Write a protein that binds this DNA or RNA. Structure first.
Lengths: 62, 377, 134, 393, 117, 349, 98, 64, 129
RNA sequence: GGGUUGCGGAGGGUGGGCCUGGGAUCCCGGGGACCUGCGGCGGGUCAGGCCUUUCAGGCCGCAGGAAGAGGAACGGAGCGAGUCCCCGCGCGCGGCGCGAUUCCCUGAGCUGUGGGACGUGCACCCAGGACUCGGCUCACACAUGC
């Protein structure tokens, strides 16, 4: 996959083909990660997200 | 064949002083031998169960014995303060299973460690009425080797050795009209008849039955609280030692309700002074608080009887807490220890004036070592 | 070393700690207490102190400077004032307890002269009767 | 200044009363800008707001915006969502290819009523076009891209089933962002209606360029009214929500990912109605004048409207027939027709029998003057017969 | 039911020669723009309403089958289509301003393609 | 003075949506702060610190004997050997104690272990594992009634841990009914070493905590002595606080003065009686109605929504649940309405 | 007095705890054990009963009391523990009150 | 009871296990003193507090 | 300047980082060990072998999005009592691994006598705050 | 749901109304109710079997109704007894704390910011939810105006 994108100043998605931003940021992938149906690792994810305060629960609702 | 007799002064052969120095203050107490006589248990102020090994008897056969430091073969850890500790009754090197030691901490339940491996094998817990754990004070094994006795506030509980759980036989002592005392100091067994004596801290002594569990006699105490109690193996005799008392008493089962004879000791502070008794009944070694280990003689001709002192010797200037003798081989181990109360003397004026006293309490030396004495023939 | 220790003790004090003593005053008081404890003439405990003040006993009251909360010793100074008794405050708890002859902190202490060691006790009384009161 | 025990009393100022309805929830926003008709009705207790709704109805009723992985298909992720949420029905907004990512609207039980209209909605697509030979400059590619604008023909690829027939799809906007000559690739953004194919578009672009090519990948940016900028959630969060609900009993993480179905019908005109008519319309009926409470200014004839309740629940979608200037003057008639029901049949107290005219007509039937099936009976009052045959009979 | 010009038979009308051989009528179809990967893409100049049929053989002025219409694209006004070449042919041979012809009855009116409610 | 610095039930009264401002101000009335001592002591709550020596059963008796009242009640039945906050009400304040008892309370206790632990990481994992819904049983032995209880726990984290002394303190935040002794027992059984609870200290009890006027019973005794020997009520007002502060997070509903007596005698809140309301009042919500001065009349259950009462003209909006005011408080004016009284007299004539 | 019958898997050995066996519940997929319920082994032998129970809703542990003439060092491995099926209780009625 | 605490900068309670603060403060007990019902020594408490101005009345007013 | 740029392009959840010389020592150790016996580089195989149990050191990447890719590995190492590291580099780690596409997870197991430099890194990771 | 035909050589594609029945632009005769939600009606390989499934369009079978939509008091509050779920003395009450009057401890068993023992007494044992029945006071209630 060669689809990269970086967050805009306003907050929109700007798709690009390069891997480096002219401002000095490293672009990430635009496609989501592989999801497995037999994924029994949902408790560790929630714990490590609660330890660092990164869940969507603490995020407000626009 | 080594004849056991007191003719000369005890001889120093070996010692151990490299330990018990890492802590600011440390005190040694106990130092009893095993029934077979191949291990030594030493308890310090810092809770560490050290099992010292026995020096080789072939090394004791000759007089060329050189000084050596006995390294502990086992070093166990304990959280809270220790209350009592004793070896198993039928302790022998032949049987590998009957080679465990018992210990009772302050808030932790009664723990049992193994001499061979060095790890906790079993543990007996005892809860009170609501949900909490009660502390045990007395610790001694039964001569048959199937029951375990422990002391408590006003009752005595009997534990087994095959079902390590909560099941235990309770035997209350205090009642509405009767009642012995408060906290029970220790419990010692007699090998002549199935009965044991219960020594408490409140000027009280009593003997109970083995299986029936019924009181027979009830006595008092010197002035304070009994600390240690043994039994004379030759017959119906047994001694008892209390705290903060300068007198000793020997109670006999052939007398009805009064002390037959009285002895003199030296106890200043509330320490746990031990006194060992020879299995042949010819010598009675006992340590004092003023730094003087005295020995007595027990005569049994038939008509005259009086404990007479043979000799006396001071190992160090400290307070000898534990004194015990080896069962077969001539040997005697002693340990010292004494607390130091904070004495905030005016050091500023001492450093300003440099006059009359020229003294400071910061340089006082206190070291608790473990010596080994030799007995001749 | 003495000035830094005194400052550290001043840091950890009680709100009601205005009547105080000097360095030599505290040393003399400690020496008097250490000379009087060996004769068994000292009382340690608010219970017996107030029990005997209700009846009446003349002496010198020595309270601690660092003891929380405040409601522990809050009626002792007024009782001593009504009974016309002076009271002493020192910014220490461990040293006051060690001077009694133990390894535990003590706050309340009453002194009672029985032997002829009062030649230094009267000086301490006259000195505590002259310290500036708040 | 710490004022304690001060004389504080609400001063009775006889001023005009104003209300600010700009911060109220989704369907209650600007509820005071609707022209008032009648404020004499008896509100019923059976009802609530979509925002503060029970979790049982929050998971049952509502949509979700998912970011589909590129590994499985759309039906497979739909079935996975149905198995994770433990529901019976589940639907999607568009059948995406396995190797096509982007947003996807998914309803579950009671929001699947209007999926037929959601499927036929304009969607945006972003993919990479692969070439075979080399192009001279990017200006020629931009010209070829702007040439393929408007309505054009499209042939179904061999992949799905077979070439069946020729379709006519319309494209609104198409512009290229970048183009790399070294790798012979390039990203482009196309915004068209549903049914348009991107692989066929790439094939046509390659045929116009004279080098050929296909569609490397594809990414959907906007699908209908919801895009990647409006709370785009993934499947891992949906899977973690059920575990947080069955192990920690926290419904916040489930209400954050699931959104009420009333959000879709936001750009449509709302029509407030009475609580006595909601059940009659759910069973099925026509919208009358006495049931209408408020209407939106700027309503034309034959316009897609939505019927809402005073609390804010979307009853159903109707087709308005009268104008605001006509509904302000007219007294009786039909203004809308039932098109697609969204609520259940048994949600409000079932009452449509008693009334000022219905009871009178029923009593006249019971007497014997008028008949139930026969309209031209005696009918002594002519003004009654000339004011009852104006709706449908 | 089905029937008419066949579906279990064969007949003929105005144009004949699609499957028989020599053609009778021909109509201009497209104009050569440029080759496309061994294929020829053309633009319909003047049929005035019509689009070609799937796999429709294309002829030249001399009525010679050069290939067949493979794909069709473009807008409604500007329409294009590709031609699949046959064997023993050269795409560089036809590189001039010439017209491409097709059979007259291989078209379809766009009036039916227009959406009517 | 601004509208956001006013007392307890008076902050941001302008933000309340206005419907009508034509009412007659009556003479009778008072503010909660400037209330008579007789009513200031009989109405209100007290957040005192319970000593660790007695139990709460004796603490409530001592406080009702010192305050010289007839009725009293506590917020949570605490053990004898535990410290923490405790809300005690009076005869005119124990009406809403049933809802105050069922509230989330935080706990802080120390756990004593038996054997040795390797590090703090494993015990931290064991503490994080016991989070959420679990099974618990009474520490003592009970009958078939108390066999299994199901409680939930929100947060649990440990601060420190001493390996030399084998102790460690922790903070747990859960709801009422959860036990701490069983929690430490389960923690010790999960660590494989066993253990119990050494002590316990409550930091939060419902809505009140140790950071909001932590008074002591000694202060209550000093106030009772000063109010009788010196006739000083300031030190008595500083310890006692009105009961209208507990219902601060609940929505407010301003009512007319004529409807206060109707609600006191027992009636239904109508549309003309409501003066203002709060945005965000859903169906079947625990709402409390107050006066124009700021005195909480009673607690009600609202039926209609803000979007419904903003349009409606007549109907029932709230239902009487529990009265807090007295009966004889406002004049008797029921049948004197503009139209309703006219219709009633018309049907009477 | 009950003879041995069909037995169902109960738990998995995790670690001992003060002469008690602390086990982790295996896949019975909704079941919780009864108090003082006899626990059996693969050879249909009465090892002990079920002691106090703890743990969360999904993953919950349980401790087992030993019988007479039993040793805790015997099964110091990862083996399965079986329980009678008549000592179960559905939890579907615990969380929902209606 | 080995439960000490020290006042924080913000003004909240921070329970600790040691008896000495790392900043140089002496920690105090977290539990209050035992109360006695038959206590006739309440007259002197207010006097002591007024002499030193440590009453609730001499402190600032509560913000509510 | 370089380490600052690597810290700018970092993942939110990565506390246990390394210093400027500890990362060089770890890179040297990994480059020495990749030729001696073996190094495991794959999420699936790492978790499959951790399910049964294998002692080692987990080497995760500092720049790898999304976080849901590697989100249950460190908690699994904590549950299995195993330490892990974090490095703000993926290209250098991928080049040191097999001179190929950038890898994310790397496991090391000592077989030869090169553990004299491995126990030092182990105790340094155990001392990492 | 069923049926017919024409256009392009050959199993594949597209398209067709309110008009009909009889007599000489006209007349006569007829077509016997609607809304809503769900399920199916298509493709591929060799007279039949297997798999998946809805873009374009109506048909069939089932579940409810004859829908012009009313309400300015059906409707409340303080108490007493019984049982269940609830309360740490588990239905055995004295192993509970504070005080005048006595004693002991730096105990190494908690322990003087208290504990151990004897004698004399006052206080301590109370609350939530559901159901049946008995029983009093108030009122029967849309909330103006100056």
């Amino acid at each position: 996959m060669f689809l990269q994108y970086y967050l805009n100043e306003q907050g929109d998605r700007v798709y690009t083909l390069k891997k480096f931003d002219p401002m000095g940021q490293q672009t990430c992938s635009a496609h989501p990660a592989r999801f497995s149906p037999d994924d029994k690792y949902s408790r560790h994810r929630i714990t490590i997200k609660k330890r660092f305060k990164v869940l969507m629960t603490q995020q407000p609702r626009p | 064949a080594w004849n056991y007799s007191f003719s000369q002064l005890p001889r120093f052969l070996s010692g151990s002083w490299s330990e018990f120095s890492t802590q600011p203050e440390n005190f040694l107490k106990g130092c009893k031998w095993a029934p077979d006589g191949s291990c030594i248990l030493t308890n310090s102020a810092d809770n560490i169960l050290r099992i010292y090994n026995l020096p080789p008897e072939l090394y004791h056969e000759g007089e060329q014995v050189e000084y050596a430091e006995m390294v502990p073969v086992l070093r166990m850890v304990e959280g809270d303060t220790i209350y009592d500790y004793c070896w198993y009754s039928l302790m022998s090197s032949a049987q590998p299973d009957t080679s465990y030691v018992a210990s009772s901490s302050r808030e932790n339940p009664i723990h049992i460690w193994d001499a061979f491996t060095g790890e906790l094998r079993a543990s007996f817990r005892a809860y009170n009425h609501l949900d909490e754990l009660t502390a045990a004070h007395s610790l001694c094994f039964s001569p048959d080797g199937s029951q375990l006795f422990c002391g408590f506030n006003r009752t005595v509980r009997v534990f087994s050795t095959a079902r390590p759980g909560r099941d235990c036989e309770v035997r209350a002592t205090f009642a509405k009209k009767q009642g012995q005392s408060g906290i029970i100091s220790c419990i010692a067994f007699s090998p002549a008849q199935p009965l044991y004596a219960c020594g408490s801290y409140g000027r009280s002594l009593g003997l109970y039955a083995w299986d029936d569990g019924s009181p027979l006699a009830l006595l008092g105490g010197h002035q304070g609280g009994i600390t240690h109690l043994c039994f004379h193996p030759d017959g119906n005799r047994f001694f008892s030692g209390a705290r903060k008392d300068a007198e000793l008493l020997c109670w006999d089962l052939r007398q009805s309700g009064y002390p037959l004879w009285s002895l003199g000791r030296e106890v200043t502070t509330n320490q746990r002074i031990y006194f060992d008794l020879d299995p042949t009944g010819q010598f009675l070694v006992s340590g004092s608080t003023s730094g003087a280990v005295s020995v007595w003689d027990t005569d049994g001709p038939g008509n005259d009887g009086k404990p007479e002192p043979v000799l006396s010797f001071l190992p160090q200037k400290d307070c000898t807490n534990g004194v015990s003798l080896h069962p077969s081989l001539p040997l005697l181990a002693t340990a010292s220890g004494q607390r130091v109360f904070p004495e905030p003397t005016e050091s500023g004026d001492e450093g300003e004036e440099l006059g009359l006293p020229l003294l400071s309490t910061r340089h006082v030396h206190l070291e608790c070592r473990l010596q080994l004495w030799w007995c001749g023939g | 070393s003495g000035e830094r220790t005194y400052q550290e003790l001043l840091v950890n004090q009680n709100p009601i700690a205005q009547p105080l003593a000097s360095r030599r005053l505290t040393r003399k008081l400690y020496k008097c207490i250490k000379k009087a404890v060996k004769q068994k003439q000292i009382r340690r405990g608010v219970k017996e102190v107030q029990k005997f003040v209700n009846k009446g006993e003349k002496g010198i009251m020595v309270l601690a400077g660092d003891t929380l909360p405040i409601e522990v010793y809050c009626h002792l100074p007024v009782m001593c004032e009504d009974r016309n008794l002076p009271y002493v405050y020192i910014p220490s708890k461990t040293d006051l307890g060690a001077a009694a002859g133990s390894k535990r902190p003590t706050c309340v202490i009453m002194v009672k002269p029985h032997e002829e060691y009062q030649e230094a006790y009267d000086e301490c009384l006259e000195e505590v009767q002259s310290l500036p009161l708040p | 200044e710490i004022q304690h025990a001060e004389e504080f009393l609400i001063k009775p100022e006889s001023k005009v009363a104003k209300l600010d309805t700009s911060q109220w929830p989704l369907l209650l926003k600007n509820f005071d800008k609707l022209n008032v008709r009648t404020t004499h009705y008896t509100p019923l207790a059976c009802g609530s707001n979509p925002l503060k709704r029970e979790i049982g109805d929050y998971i049952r009723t509502g949509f979700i915006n998912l970011d589909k992985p590129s590994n499985p298909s759309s039906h497979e992720v739909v079935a996975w969502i149905r198995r994770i949420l433990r529901v019976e029905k589940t639907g999607h907004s568009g059948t995406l290819d396995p190797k096509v990512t982007g947003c996807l609207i998914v309803c579950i039980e009671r929001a699947t009523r209007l999926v037929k209209s959601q499927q036929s909605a304009g969607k945006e697509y972003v993919g990479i076009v692969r070439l075979h030979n080399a192009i001279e400059g990017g200006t020629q590619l931009s010209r070829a891209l702007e040439t393929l604008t408007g309505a054009l023909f499209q042939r179904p690829p061999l992949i799905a089933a077979v070439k069946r027939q020729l379709r006519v799809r319309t494209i609104y906007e198409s512009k290229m962002i970048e183009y790399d000559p070294e790798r012979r690739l390039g990203i482009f953004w196309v915004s068209c209606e549903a049914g348009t194919y991107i692989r066929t578009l790439c094939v046509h672009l390659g045929l116009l360029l004279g080098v050929g090519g296909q569609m490397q990948e594809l990414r959907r940016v906007r699908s209908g009214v919801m895009s990647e900028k409006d709370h785009m959630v993934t499947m891992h969060d949906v899977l973690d929500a059920q575990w947080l609900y069955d192990n920690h009993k926290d419904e916040s993480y489930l209400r954050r990912v699931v959104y009420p179905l009333e959000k879709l019908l936001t750009s449509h005109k709302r029509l407030v109605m009475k609580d006595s008519a909601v059940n009659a319309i759910c069973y099925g009926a026509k919208i009358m004048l006495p049931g209408v409470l408020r209407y939106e200014d700027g309503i034309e004839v034959n316009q897609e409207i939505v019927v809402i309740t005073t609390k804010g629940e979307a009853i159903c979608m109707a087709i308005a027939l009268m104008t605001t200037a006509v509904i302000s003057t007219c007294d009786h008639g039909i203004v809308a027709k039932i098109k697609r029901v969204i609520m259940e049949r048994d949600t409000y107290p079932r009452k449509w029998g008693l009334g000022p005219k219905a009871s009178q007509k029923k009593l006249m039937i019971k007497q014997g003057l008028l008949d139930k099936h026969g309209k031209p009976t005696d009918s002594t009052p002519a003004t009654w017969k000339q004011e009852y045959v104006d709706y449908s009979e | 039911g089905r029937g008419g010009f066949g579906r279990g038979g064969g007949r003929g009308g105005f144009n004949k020669g699609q499957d028989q051989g020599p053609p009778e009528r021909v109509v201009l179809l497209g104009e050569f723009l440029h080759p496309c990967e061994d294929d020829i893409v053309c633009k319909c100049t003047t049929d005035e309403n019509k689009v070609p049929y799937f796999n429709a053989p294309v002829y030249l002025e001399n009525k010679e089958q050069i290939g067949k219409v493979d794909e069709i694209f473009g807008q409604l006004r500007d329409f294009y289509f590709s031609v699949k070449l046959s064997e023993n042919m050269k795409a560089s041979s036809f590189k001039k301003l010439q017209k491409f012809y097709i059979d007259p009855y291989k078209l379809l009116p766009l009036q039916r393609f227009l959406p009517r409610p």
